[PDB]
Ligand binder design. Structure first.
Ligand code: RET
Ligand code: RET
Ligand code: RET
Ligand code: NA
Ligand code: NA
Ligand code: NA
Ligand code: NA
Ligand code: NA
Ligand code: NA
Ligand code: NA
Ligand code: NA
Ligand code: NA
Ligand code: NA
Ligand code: NA
Ligand code: NA
Ligand code: NA
Ligand code: NA
Ligand code: NA
Ligand code: NA
Ligand code: NA
Ligand code: NA
Ligand code: NA
Ligand code: NA
Ligand code: NA
Ligand code: NA
Ligand code: NA
Ligand code: NA
Ligand code: NA
Ligand code: NA
Ligand code: NA
Ligand code: NA
Ligand code: NA
Ligand code: NA
Ligand code: NA
Ligand code: NA
Ligand code: NA
Ligand code: NA
Ligand code: NA
Ligand code: NA
Ligand code: NA
Ligand code: NA
Ligand code: NA
Ligand code: NA
Ligand code: NA
Ligand code: NA
Ligand code: NA
Ligand code: NA
Ligand code: NA
Ligand code: NA
Ligand code: NA
Ligand code: NA
Lengths: 259, 259, 259
């Protein structure tokens, strides 16, 4: 996908790519080990057994759709390792997961969403996943367009995200009442990261260098790194503990859900 | 995927890209609203209920594989919005869904096919989808190759499409007889768009600027826009009404299919 | 994905791309017909019926996940046809499946793996497929990086492959004992190509022009062509005959597996 990165004299001072790459690479390395390591603990804990009491799994193995939290974190930790490699080489390298904004999210956010859809038994899974993929590609396109048609790609994703988010909130509110009081407490916090932090990504674009010019690319990277520590690892850990409490109630104690 | 689009003085007169972009953008905008709006009505009508009498769905929600018609139309309307943005910027923009011919079809045509495969309960779904993806990438490659090896990529897709189409016609003829007389009437017309219009795409290449030079890129765009109004929206609407009649017979009236 | 291929004066003598393209194209043509033709025989034989006695399939059609061997071979034969077209045009063509090393494997190796996972009824299918995709993209990135950070991408894939391969070996050893003596003999040989040849790909990188400089790009292509004749076609044929013997025991003779 690339045709031109770092110039031979280095980045020109005044470019959006003239950043502190040693600092950014350090932050990406911390994120890599944190997010990827959280996904590895998550995988380990899945295989340990069912709830908090670790009841042996029914088939002997973990359900396949219980792994999306772990996988999103393990894939994002790998993407952050690629990012540290680019930042430590000074930017603009042939394989850069830093260059195209939101491309890394095309591969990670569908998995975070699948985690919710499967854990909460949400209908219209295909419609929801397709929606999110469309939206993320509109963001990729908005960052790549050098004209005011970047606001057209931005608005097309908003036309896909506003319906998606309202439909999902409705569905998750319906499911919330089925859950036991202890699992509803964990879910509250997952819903505040999924529906409270997901809308911030679009607003940050509006204040960026491709918007009002308040947030530069270096600051945008730091903000997104912190947002990914919450929207990937904290989210996945909350979702793992929701499932452990769910299955401690439903599988280990055999009690029922409040339909 | 891009390395060079519009020159700074504009397109050179005599290039394949020297077209009437204001007119093409207008046509793409009409297509966007028409195809995307048809996909939105389709989604609405899916959720309304089962047949023409709108019987409540069994699970409360629509079956997941009943949404492929709507999704193909909604995705193509979004791709046509991206196309209007490129045409209104004058062509050759970093994110151009106009530049690489048949790339938009790599993402939309598998969904049109899945709609048929699932609605008509066709076997070998993986083989058929894989086949179509291969073929479309051979077309992408044929448009990108500047030599006579473009006819080798073209012929490799023909080696994948001729078997696919004959195998699918056999399968759809077998399924046709299971359906009731009223649903067979709607299906006739779907089969004439799927098996009558799908083969025209390869013939148009042979008369294009990469073939005999009768059809330029501007005319090729207009032809494909009209073909997409029939192969996406008219097809999906016929497929929706086939399903409404099917389920009015089988679900609402509880009558059986003629095995 | 491309921005620059063959120069107008041709490749410079001393480039990694100054190779014997007429010879390489001939080898790719042989591979195309061999691998693709093996996938076509495999498809034919799937549809013939169940075991060696060709018992009619239960649904009338072959199970969908019995086709991954055929599909991997048919897709690799098509990729090798694209490769012959590039080699016969002299290299560096816009659509080159030769340029980016291991990109062709991103599309073929997941299907070889799915064949094993489904045939041997292996758990954690998503985890295994995701793992392999990650690893192959790290290899794509290692071949594209011009610095010593190529060894960082290489090592990140090794961190994904070593766990994958050990976990799969454990799982396949568990499944091996369920199978009858005759099917265990065929499986031995499949396991020697899957677990004996798969690790050679990483070692070849270390001796390549991006490693110690013993293996040039021309020799690397020939080695990989031979490796693909074994890891695609020989593997798929062994897997087909394992399934025919399995189903001759379990379906045709109705005998049971040794749990
Ligand atoms: C829909 C939308 C956007 C992106 C939203 C994102 C990025 C959501 C991501 C959530 C994540 C990244 C969780 C981890 C825009 C792109 C900026 C474009 C249009 C509005
Ligand atoms: C198989 C084939 C082609 C394309 C066929 C297409 C494009 C079918 C599309 C149907 C659509 C687009 C429905 C909507 C070629 C590419 C030109 C290359 C080889 C023959
Ligand atoms: C995991 C790994 C690699 C690739 C392994 C491959 C290529 C396995 C392929 C098997 C095939 C191709 C079967 C057919 C490296 C990339 C070189 C990078 C890191 C270690
Ligand atoms: Na940069
Ligand atoms: Na998990
Ligand atoms: Na998750
Ligand atoms: Na960069
Ligand atoms: Na990128
Ligand atoms: Na970025
Ligand atoms: Na960045
Ligand atoms: Na970044
Ligand atoms: Na950038
Ligand atoms: Na960008
Ligand atoms: Na990004
Ligand atoms: Na990115
Ligand atoms: Na949630
Ligand atoms: Na970042
Ligand atoms: Na996560
Ligand atoms: Na859990
Ligand atoms: Na153009
Ligand atoms: Na629909
Ligand atoms: Na359709
Ligand atoms: Na264009
Ligand atoms: Na394009
Ligand atoms: Na086009
Ligand atoms: Na065009
Ligand atoms: Na076009
Ligand atoms: Na073009
Ligand atoms: Na093209
Ligand atoms: Na096109
Ligand atoms: Na296109
Ligand atoms: Na049809
Ligand atoms: Na068009
Ligand atoms: Na459609
Ligand atoms: Na319908
Ligand atoms: Na070359
Ligand atoms: Na097969
Ligand atoms: Na295989
Ligand atoms: Na080449
Ligand atoms: Na390539
Ligand atoms: Na290659
Ligand atoms: Na090569
Ligand atoms: Na090659
Ligand atoms: Na190369
Ligand atoms: Na390469
Ligand atoms: Na390769
Ligand atoms: Na390749
Ligand atoms: Na094996
Ligand atoms: Na090769
Ligand atoms: Na194979
Ligand atoms: Na078989």
């Amino acid at each position: 996908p690339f045709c031109g990165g770092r110039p031979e004299d280095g980045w020109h001072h005044g470019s959006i790519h003239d950043m502190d790459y040693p600092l950014l690479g350090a932050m990406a390395a911390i994120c890599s080990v944190f997010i990827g390591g959280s996904g590895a603990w998550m995988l380990y804990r899945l295989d340990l057994g069912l709830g908090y009491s670790c009841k042996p799994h029914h088939s002997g193995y973990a359900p396949e759709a219980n792994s999306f939290s772990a996988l999103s974190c393990l894939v994002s930790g790998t993407i952050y390792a690629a990012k540290t490699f680019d930042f430590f080489d000074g930017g603009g390298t042939p394989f850069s997961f830093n260059w195209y904004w939101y491309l890394d999210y095309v591969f990670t956010c569908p998995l975070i969403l699948l985690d919710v859809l499967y854990t909460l038994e949400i209908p219209h899974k295909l419609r929801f996943v397709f929606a999110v993929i469309i939206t993320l590609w509109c963001g990729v396109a908005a960052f790549v367009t050098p004209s005011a048609f970047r606001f057209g790609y931005y608005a097309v994703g908003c036309v896909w995200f506003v319906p998606f988010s309202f439909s999902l909130l409705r569905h998750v509110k319906q499911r919330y009442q089925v859950y036991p009081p202890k699992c509803q407490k964990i879910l509250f916090w997952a819903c505040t990261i999924f529906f409270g932090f997901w809308p911030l990504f679009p607003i940050l674009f509006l204040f960026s260098w491709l918007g009002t010019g308040h947030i530069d690319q270096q600051a945008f990277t730091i903000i997104h790194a912190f947002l990914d520590l919450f929207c990937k690892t904290v989210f996945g850990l909350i979702m793992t503990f929701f499932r452990l409490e769910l299955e401690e109630h439903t599988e280990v104690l055999g009690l029922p859900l409040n339909e």
